[PDB]
Amino acid sequence: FVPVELATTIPVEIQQAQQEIKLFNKWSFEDVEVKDASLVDYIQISKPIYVAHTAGRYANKRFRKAQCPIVERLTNSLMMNGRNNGKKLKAVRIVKHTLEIINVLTDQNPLQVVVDAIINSGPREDTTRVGGGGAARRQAVDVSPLRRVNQSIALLTIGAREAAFRNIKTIAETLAEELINAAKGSSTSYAIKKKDELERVAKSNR
Amino acid sequence: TPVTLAKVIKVLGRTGSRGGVTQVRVEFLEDTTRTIVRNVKGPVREGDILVLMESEREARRLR
Amino acid sequence: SQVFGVARIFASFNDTFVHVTDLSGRETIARVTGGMKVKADRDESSPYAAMLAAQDVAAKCKEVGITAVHIKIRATGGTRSKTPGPGGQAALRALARSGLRIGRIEDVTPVPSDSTRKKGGRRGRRL
Amino acid sequence: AKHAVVLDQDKFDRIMKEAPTYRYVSVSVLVDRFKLGGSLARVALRHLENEGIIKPVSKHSKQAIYTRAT
RNA sequence: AAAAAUGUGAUCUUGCUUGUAAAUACAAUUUUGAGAGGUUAAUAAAUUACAAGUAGUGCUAUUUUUGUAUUUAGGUUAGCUAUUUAGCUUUACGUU
RNA sequence: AUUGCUCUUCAACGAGGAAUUCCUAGUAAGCGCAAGUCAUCAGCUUGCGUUGAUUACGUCCCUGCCCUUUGUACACACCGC
Ligand SMILES: [Mg+2]
Ligand SMILES: [Mg+2]
């Protein structure tokens, strides 16, 4: 609605996807409510950003990493490994591709799917090694929400990377697949498997 | 899977032989006013919520 | 209603027993021990093993037809320790979990009047 | 070599049957459903984009995401 | 495998107790750089092959048609661990 | 083969065991430049900017170091006597 004539002419589609709704890259950023206390506030879809790229003075105080967007976090995670280290643009592109793939698959909001995947991936209880004389006894311990989220983010990325290593399946696609798996809690994905293992370990040491 | 949704009222000191675990007093979401001191691994804050499997089992300072 | 037993947890250092019996004592039910459920020599008194043993005992009891127990605990006694082992408590916990009911708990460790000479010698036990 | 590089009329026909179906067609997706290898797959995809059938989503080098009409 | 029909003292094919004929090749990186002396001791595997004593069942079963076939195809251990509907290795057995 | 370039040869290596280094933000890692030496040679170095994360923001488990109290036949001081 209302394409205003600026001397430097803008594409029609671009003009359309502006102003009226505070969208993501192309499509809408709304909805996506987690409905799982702990992972609300530390998975932030409340802040509507247009690209998975900011300057971002997030690593500064302590919990400002929470308020950093989910997409951005994902991109950062992807950026892992020296060969691919830095190169945030590439990561962003990959993320975009993944999102597109998600959209293509069963319609549905891509962001929502991602969120779901993240939720699935967070381990509830993890073990930490205690001294206790000398032997390697491992006490099971509860996981803090932010930490859990971080772990989830990592795990998916790792899985994607694994999939990529000697493969057609372009990292983005692998990531998308992983996300899908997480959404439909299958235990075919890597992150999910890891989580399960962790849970088992916790059970063993309780 | 019976899961208990817990909530943090007070951080009761950093614990463990090493650094990465914290003692936390916990008033759980449903059925309030039953405080348990349980251990939390990551970054913790007042009003954070904890997802957990095995609820009624109080922990102590790890050696 | 409640068919009873006497649990008898001989919780020494370096092994636990769980020895469920009738009230007279003579006719036993299950004698399950720590070293029986974990073949590792070291892991006999170890809690997990003890728990396993307890579970086994409970199962046996169930098979037989018993509902409750009277916990009696025995530390090695006399010439040794007089200190309940690592896996008596664990065993008890396991029993509780099992659902085999509990009534009248005691420690019947044979703490003497004035023992006959102990371990070590006069200079003791010098690691 | 793991095969799936050899080219035929029959193979082409099977590929055609059909562009319809599949949420997305990605060179990767094509291989390995055990189809004609990489380049061949790409070519097939391109062909499919001649006159309708499969419309595009992305356009990048190697990240080429296409989906069924309409 | 499908099918038409001849004939054998009606017909047909589930294994049990026996002894002999044969396929686990070849080797090298290594073993103390080359030769000799022992596969020391130990030890045959069920697998295929023909016939017995018939529970079976009368043992041996022939002459001609339709297709490139149309037939029914694929895969199992052994150990460790309180990750025990899971984790790690994954044919061990003098060493490879 | 100083080094560069041109064609040709296409080896090992499918993310590396026991171990162990460095790191807390424009950092880490990547990326190149830059002077230094220099007649000629950069895989080095001191700087520089570009791209730019993950995870803590704690603890004394290890390692080292520091103190305090303790014990000392040591004072060339535990490689001691
Ligand atoms: Mg080559
Ligand atoms: Mg130099």
Curated annotation (Swiss-Prot), chain B:
**CC per GO annotation:** cytosolic small ribosomal subunit
Presence of the UniProt keyword Ribonucleoprotein in the record: yes
* This protein's record includes keyword Kinase: no
Listed under GO biological process in this entry are: maturation of SSU-rRNA; ribosomal small subunit assembly; translation
Under the heading InterPro entries, the entry gives: NA-bd_OB-fold, Ribosomal_eS28, Ribosomal_eS28_CS
Identify a single GO molecular function assigned to this protein.
structural constituent of ribosome
The lineage's top-level taxon is Eukaryota
Keywords attached to this Swiss-Prot or TrEMBL record, sorted alphabetically, are: Ribonucleoprotein, Ribosomal protein
| Family classification | Belongs to the eukaryotic ribosomal protein eS28 family.
**The protein's name in its UniProt record:** Small ribosomal subunit protein eS28
Q: Which organism is it from?
A: Kluyveromyces lactis (strain ATCC 8585 / CBS 2359 / DSM 70799 / NBRC 1267 / NRRL Y-1140 / WM37) (Yeast)
From Swiss-Prot, chain C:
Q: Where is this region: Disordered?
A: 106-127
Instruction: Please state what the protein is called.
Output: Small ribosomal subunit protein uS11
Which residue ranges have biased composition labelled Basic residues?
Answer: 118-127
Q: Does this UniProt record's set of keywords contain Ribonucleoprotein?
A: yes
The gene that this protein is the product of is RPS14
Keywords per UniProt:
Ribonucleoprotein, Ribosomal protein
GO molecular function per UniProt: structural constituent of ribosome
Return the HAMAP family for the record: Ribosomal_uS11
Q: Which superkingdom, per the lineage?
A: Eukaryota
By its UniProt entry, which PROSITE patterns does this protein fall under?
A: RIBOSOMAL_S11 (PS00054)
The text of the family note is:
Belongs to the universal ribosomal protein uS11 family.
Q: Which Pfam families match?
A: Ribosomal_S11 (PF00411)
| Keyword flag NADP | no
